[PDB]
RNA sequence: AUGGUGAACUAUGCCUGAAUAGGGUGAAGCCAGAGGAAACUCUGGUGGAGGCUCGUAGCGGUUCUGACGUGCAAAUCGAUC
RNA sequence: UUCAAAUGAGAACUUUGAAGACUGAAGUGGGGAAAGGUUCCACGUCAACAGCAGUUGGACGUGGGUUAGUCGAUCCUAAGA
RNA sequence: AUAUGGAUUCUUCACGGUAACGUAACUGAAUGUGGAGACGUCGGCGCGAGCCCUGGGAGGAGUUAUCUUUUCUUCUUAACAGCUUAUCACCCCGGAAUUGGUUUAUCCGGAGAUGGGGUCUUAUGGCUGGAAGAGGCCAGCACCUUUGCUGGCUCCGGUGCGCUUGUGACGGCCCGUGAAAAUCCACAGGAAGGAAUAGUUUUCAUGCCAGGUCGUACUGAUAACCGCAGCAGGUCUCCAAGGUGAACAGCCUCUAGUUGAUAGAAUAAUGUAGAUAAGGGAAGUCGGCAAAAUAGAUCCGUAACUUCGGGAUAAGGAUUGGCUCUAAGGGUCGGGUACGAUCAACUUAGAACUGGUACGGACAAGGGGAAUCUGACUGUCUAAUUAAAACAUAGCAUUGCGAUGGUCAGAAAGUGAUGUUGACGCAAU
């Protein structure tokens, strides 16, 4: 890093949008079943493997 | 090649407030100013006077304004007048004693 | 980035088609050793270089400043 | 006491990464990167730095009035003049001898 | 004042390699570093520069030569043999 | 047994880069001088040689059969080297 | 390591002032390559996490932030492919 | 993209200089050729920059029982541009034994020295432009504010085996002689095009438009990377202050940064880590394991043996602080065609005095000696129980091979290694 390829900037940027908690309004829909976000990620817990 | 330099200090502002005695003060200069290495040897090479409200020094021997600030700091400390008065250059070589 | 000395070449610079603006500068300085004197630099700004003409004589400067094209944008000091 | 940092992302000490410490109007020390040095062009005959010709890294020779890249003589900016001297002399003399070689063996054939 | 009874330039090698070997080198080293007479301009300025190559200080001529010395004993006989044989062809 | 995946560790070659306080020794070459009938021999300098030497960084890993041995650590830590 | 203040339900651990020390320019200073990918900064803020703690954080919530004719890439060729 | 100015031409494609060469310009197709890109390492020596040290002056700060014309600190100048600046190299004059010139380092000259006079490279530096308007340091007024507002000063020098880096002219080394291409210029060439009623000229000046795409945060580590982790491990590099000292050592400091690592009370046994111990001195033990001893520098003094290079710091000795003096060692100038004047350095030897005989006063820093065995040496390996006498090595010797070949690769092949090779070679022991 520190001087990256646009391919990698993307995945990096895509991964930044996926790093939010559940939108709580979803919690309210009929039959809704998703308690929490089970696909979250931390920079110092799981590495992206590029 | 010889040169004769002058040094003015406006001692008014603390003189008027009583806590300053341009008398014994110019006297401090007059015999603790070092002249090729010792006191008193002001041998018509340097002069100290007072204009009642102003001190004057004129030199022909090695004497810098940094020296003149060193001495009065010492006088001002010898008589407890620190906290109350500062030595300050107003204009180049024109000094004074600021009170407040 | 360029210095000038010909006080005729100077004048013609200030009448160049691209020379929009110019500025006049005043430094107090000193002479030989004894005393001071008032210096004056005449900077003209071309599309690709700032020509500046130092005139060390106070007199020559006062006459020069009037020679300036009245359509020129002068920045005094 | 005042230290200094490279001004480019390259952190290593290479020929294209030479530094030069400098005092700015700010009163601070600062690195400045320094282009590699120019070397003098040379005589393609004798091999010396060929005099009268200016020296700058190669592409900089295209930003220069033609006089900086030449001297005003036969084979000017290209050979060292004492080289030109030589190849004039040898030219003349060998062209001459060519005459002495011909008419001489023109006699051989006639006296044989 | 003389510094070494015998080892000469070979004195860099200290105590190592065995005397005999230093001798063999020294002989050849003295040959290679030595300064030689130029056939062409006549000054003793021919000095070596990597095995086989011999070049004149001034006048800048370069002769191909022996590995450690300028003229191989062999090569020089050869120079003469060719002399001889050549001669036959005109006369 | 069949078909695949590895030289990010490591082994070796190539290509292109980078790195190494201060000391000791004093090899060729060079200058001046001394003796001697001669052949030749000596002295003082200068100079800066080496898979040379003292020793940091570096690289290594000798001993304590030291620490630790449910560790800081699936090989580390200390001193010594 | 210490005294105080401030903050807070709560302060051995946060902020600030004071004191004592440390690294000692071969750095515990100032920057970068590889690698990470937002950790950078601000505001909010402690359920879990930081093997005592917590009002603090590389944690949590929510936002903001990376500007180039000249710095790199891009072009060149190296071993090789 | 181009337009004006200048330069050039009735001798069409410039002049000047004896010459090295000069310059604001001063046409040039194919084609060829030359240079630059472009190159090892070490050594000393020369110079540059930044740093270090330091005098005077102007400021601000610190200490002041006492002492110190004191301690600390500010005083700066970018790219780019003009002029000027060089060791080297070269030109002109001239003609050399009584040989001279000359580096720290011994090279140079009748293939033209020493001498005089010139020419070039612009590394580098100087002064001016940029540029004081910036920046830096102060004082003197204002007020919740945005935050101003007004004045000043920013000057002149010194030193060098200093440190770091840059660089030049040289020297050593090699069976090692230490990339390539893109790219830019030059020259040889002369096809061609081009003037007097007006042409040629954009390598001289000035002028106009344009410059996309992707990366740009931060960590870089005793918490941002890899070791299941905020792991005492691992992980490529630049910058680098003062003292002491030989020093980028250790030890203390400035600047900057930390003050992170659960805490409290006690100090039993046994520990881990750091120390001392009377008399004796290895009697301990497989074994002096561990520990102790030694140590710098100056001087003196040094054996067998030896491949003559070493062995060697052999061994063995003495000395060392503070302070106060003496002597030696240098630079710069004017001398008709003997000396005078000043400036700025730590080295080295000596001599006094001095102390609870101490002084490399901490830090730092070799134990020596006589043999046997074994490997010549330096070098290498079992990452994680073996570093050795084991491997390598130069040296010695043997073998194969002249290319329709030796040796070796492949399933094959219009295939491949040695081979950019040729017996002073490659291959195999
Ligand atoms: Mg950067
Ligand atoms: Mg290098
Ligand atoms: Mg590059
Ligand atoms: Mg020229
Ligand atoms: Mg020129
Ligand atoms: Mg690899
Ligand atoms: Mg060294
Ligand atoms: Mg030593
Ligand atoms: Mg050494
Ligand atoms: Mg005699
Ligand atoms: Mg040496
Ligand atoms: Mg060695
Ligand atoms: Mg050693
Ligand atoms: Mg040492
Ligand atoms: Mg180590
Ligand atoms: Mg090793
Ligand atoms: Mg160990
Ligand atoms: Mg153990
Ligand atoms: Mg245990
Ligand atoms: Mg060691
Ligand atoms: Mg604490
Ligand atoms: Mg605190
Ligand atoms: Mg300390
Ligand atoms: Mg250190
Ligand atoms: Mg830390
Ligand atoms: Mg990261
Ligand atoms: Mg975010
Ligand atoms: Mg943060
Ligand atoms: Mg909690
Ligand atoms: Mg955590
Ligand atoms: Mg906890
Ligand atoms: Mg808790
Ligand atoms: Mg967040
Ligand atoms: Mg560039
Ligand atoms: Mg591109
Ligand atoms: Mg002309
Ligand atoms: Mg070419
Ligand atoms: Mg070439
Ligand atoms: Mg290269
Ligand atoms: Mg300073
Ligand atoms: Mg530039
Ligand atoms: Mg001359
Ligand atoms: Mg002349
Ligand atoms: Mg010297
Ligand atoms: Mg370095
Ligand atoms: Mg060479
Ligand atoms: Mg060229
Ligand atoms: Mg042009
Ligand atoms: Mg395009
Ligand atoms: Mg950045
Ligand atoms: Mg950073
Ligand atoms: Mg960190
Ligand atoms: Mg990790
Ligand atoms: Mg993982
Ligand atoms: Mg760790
Ligand atoms: Mg930090
Ligand atoms: Mg702990
Ligand atoms: Mg405890
Ligand atoms: Mg005892
Ligand atoms: Mg005893
Ligand atoms: Mg005994
Ligand atoms: Mg026993
Ligand atoms: Mg035994
Ligand atoms: Mg026994
Ligand atoms: Mg032991
Ligand atoms: Mg003892
Ligand atoms: Mg023996
Ligand atoms: Mg011995
Ligand atoms: Mg004494
Ligand atoms: Mg003297
Ligand atoms: Mg004198
Ligand atoms: Mg061995
Ligand atoms: Mg092992
Ligand atoms: Mg194993
Ligand atoms: Mg070993
Ligand atoms: Mg072992
Ligand atoms: Mg043998
Ligand atoms: Mg076939
Ligand atoms: Zn010759």
Curated annotation (Swiss-Prot), chain A:
Ranges for region Disordered: 1-21
Keyword flag Repeat: no
Places the protein is found: Cytoplasm
Cysteine pairings via disulfide bonds: none
Pfam families recorded: Ribosomal_L39
MF term (GO), any: structural constituent of ribosome
Alphabetical UniProt keywords: Cytoplasm, Ribonucleoprotein, Ribosomal protein
UniProt-listed InterPro entries: Ribosomal_eL39, Ribosomal_eL39_CS, Ribosomal_eL39_dom_sf
A Gene Ontology term for the protein's cellular component: cytoplasm
GO biological process per UniProt: cytoplasmic translation
Compositionally skewed regions (Basic residues) per UniProt: 6-19
SUPFAM superfamilies: Ribosomal protein L39e
PROSITE patterns per UniProt: RIBOSOMAL_L39E (PS00051)
The keyword Transmembrane appears for this protein: no
Main subcellular location of this protein, as a coarse class: cytoplasm
Signal peptide start and end residues: none
Subunit-structure text: Component of the large ribosomal subunit (LSU). Mature yeast ribosomes consist of a small (40S) and a large (60S) subunit. The 40S small subunit contains 1 molecule of ribosomal RNA (18S rRNA) and 33 different proteins (encoded by 57 genes). The large 60S subunit contains 3 rRNA molecules (25S, 5.8S and 5S rRNA) and 46 different proteins (encoded by 81 genes). eL39 interacts with YIH1.
Protein function: Component of the ribosome, a large ribonucleoprotein complex responsible for the synthesis of proteins in the cell. The small ribosomal subunit (SSU) binds messenger RNAs (mRNAs) and translates the encoded message by selecting cognate aminoacyl-transfer RNA (tRNA) molecules. The large subunit (LSU) contains the ribosomal catalytic site termed the peptidyl transferase center (PTC), which catalyzes the formation of peptide bonds, thereby polymerizing the amino acids delivered by tRNAs into a polypeptide chain.
Xref: HAMAP family: Ribosomal_eL39
Family named by the database record: Belongs to the eukaryotic ribosomal protein eL39 family.
From Swiss-Prot, chain B:
Part of the full-length chain shown: 9 to 108 of 121
More about this protein: Present with 60400 molecules/cell in log phase SD medium. There are 2 genes for eL22 in yeast.
A GO term, aspect molecular function: structural constituent of ribosome
Keyword Lyase: no
Source organism (scientific name): Saccharomyces cerevisiae (strain ATCC 204508 / S288c)
Chain's role: Component of the ribosome, a large ribonucleoprotein complex responsible for the synthesis of proteins in the cell. The small ribosomal subunit (SSU) binds messenger RNAs (mRNAs) and translates the encoded message by selecting cognate aminoacyl-transfer RNA (tRNA) molecules. The large subunit (LSU) contains the ribosomal catalytic site termed the peptidyl transferase center (PTC), which catalyzes the formation of peptide bonds, thereby polymerizing the amino acids delivered by tRNAs into a polypeptide chain.
Subcellular location: Cytoplasm
Keywords: Cytoplasm, Ribonucleoprotein, Ribosomal protein
Biological process, per Gene Ontology: cytoplasmic translation
Name of the protein: Large ribosomal subunit protein eL22A
Keyword DNA repair: no
Record text on subunit structure and interactions: Component of the large ribosomal subunit (LSU). Mature yeast ribosomes consist of a small (40S) and a large (60S) subunit. The 40S small subunit contains 1 molecule of ribosomal RNA (18S rRNA) and 33 different proteins (encoded by 57 genes). The large 60S subunit contains 3 rRNA molecules (25S, 5.8S and 5S rRNA) and 46 different proteins (encoded by 81 genes).
Family under the similarity heading: Belongs to the eukaryotic ribosomal protein eL22 family.
Curated annotation (Swiss-Prot), chain C:
Keywords: Cytoplasm, Ribonucleoprotein, Ribosomal protein
Subcellular location(s) of the protein: Cytoplasm
InterPro entries found in the cross-reference section: Ribosomal_eL38 (IPR002675), Ribosomal_eL38_sf (IPR038464)
Disulphide connectivity of cysteines: none
Domain of life: Eukaryota
Cytoplasm as UniProt keyword: yes
Molecular function, one GO term: structural constituent of ribosome
Main location: cytoplasm
Pfam family, one: Ribosomal_L38e
Gene Ontology CC: cytoplasm; cytosol; cytosolic large ribosomal subunit
Key word Membrane present: no
GO biological process, one term: protein-RNA complex assembly
Coiled coil: none
Family: Belongs to the eukaryotic ribosomal protein eL38 family.
Function, in words: Component of the ribosome, a large ribonucleoprotein complex responsible for the synthesis of proteins in the cell. The small ribosomal subunit (SSU) binds messenger RNAs (mRNAs) and translates the encoded message by selecting cognate aminoacyl-transfer RNA (tRNA) molecules. The large subunit (LSU) contains the ribosomal catalytic site termed the peptidyl transferase center (PTC), which catalyzes the formation of peptide bonds, thereby polymerizing the amino acids delivered by tRNAs into a polypeptide chain.
Something else known: Present with 50200 molecules/cell in log phase SD medium.
The protein's name: Large ribosomal subunit protein eL38
Organism of provenance: Saccharomyces cerevisiae (strain ATCC 204508 / S288c) (Baker's yeast)
Record gene name: RPL38
UniProtKB/Swiss-Prot annotation, chain D:
InterPro entries reported for this sequence: Ribosomal_eL34 (IPR008195), Ribosomal_eL34_C_sf (IPR038562), Ribosomal_eL34_CS (IPR018065)
Entry keyword Cytoplasm: yes
GO molecular function list: structural constituent of ribosome
Any one GO CC term of the record: cytosol
Compartmental location: Cytoplasm
A Pfam family matched in the record: Ribosomal_L34e
Broad class of the protein's primary localization: cytoplasm
Protein's GO biological process: cytoplasmic translation; ribosome biogenesis
UniProtKB keywords: Cytoplasm, Ribonucleoprotein, Ribosomal protein
Physiological role: Component of the ribosome, a large ribonucleoprotein complex responsible for the synthesis of proteins in the cell. The small ribosomal subunit (SSU) binds messenger RNAs (mRNAs) and translates the encoded message by selecting cognate aminoacyl-transfer RNA (tRNA) molecules. The large subunit (LSU) contains the ribosomal catalytic site termed the peptidyl transferase center (PTC), which catalyzes the formation of peptide bonds, thereby polymerizing the amino acids delivered by tRNAs into a polypeptide chain.
Family named by the database record: Belongs to the eukaryotic ribosomal protein eL34 family.
PANTHER family the record matches: 60S RIBOSOMAL PROTEIN L34
Note, other: Present with 23600 molecules/cell in log phase SD medium.
Name of the molecule in the record: Large ribosomal subunit protein eL34A
Record organism: Saccharomyces cerevisiae (strain ATCC 204508 / S288c)
Phylogenetic lineage: Eukaryota, Fungi, Dikarya, Ascomycota, Saccharomycotina
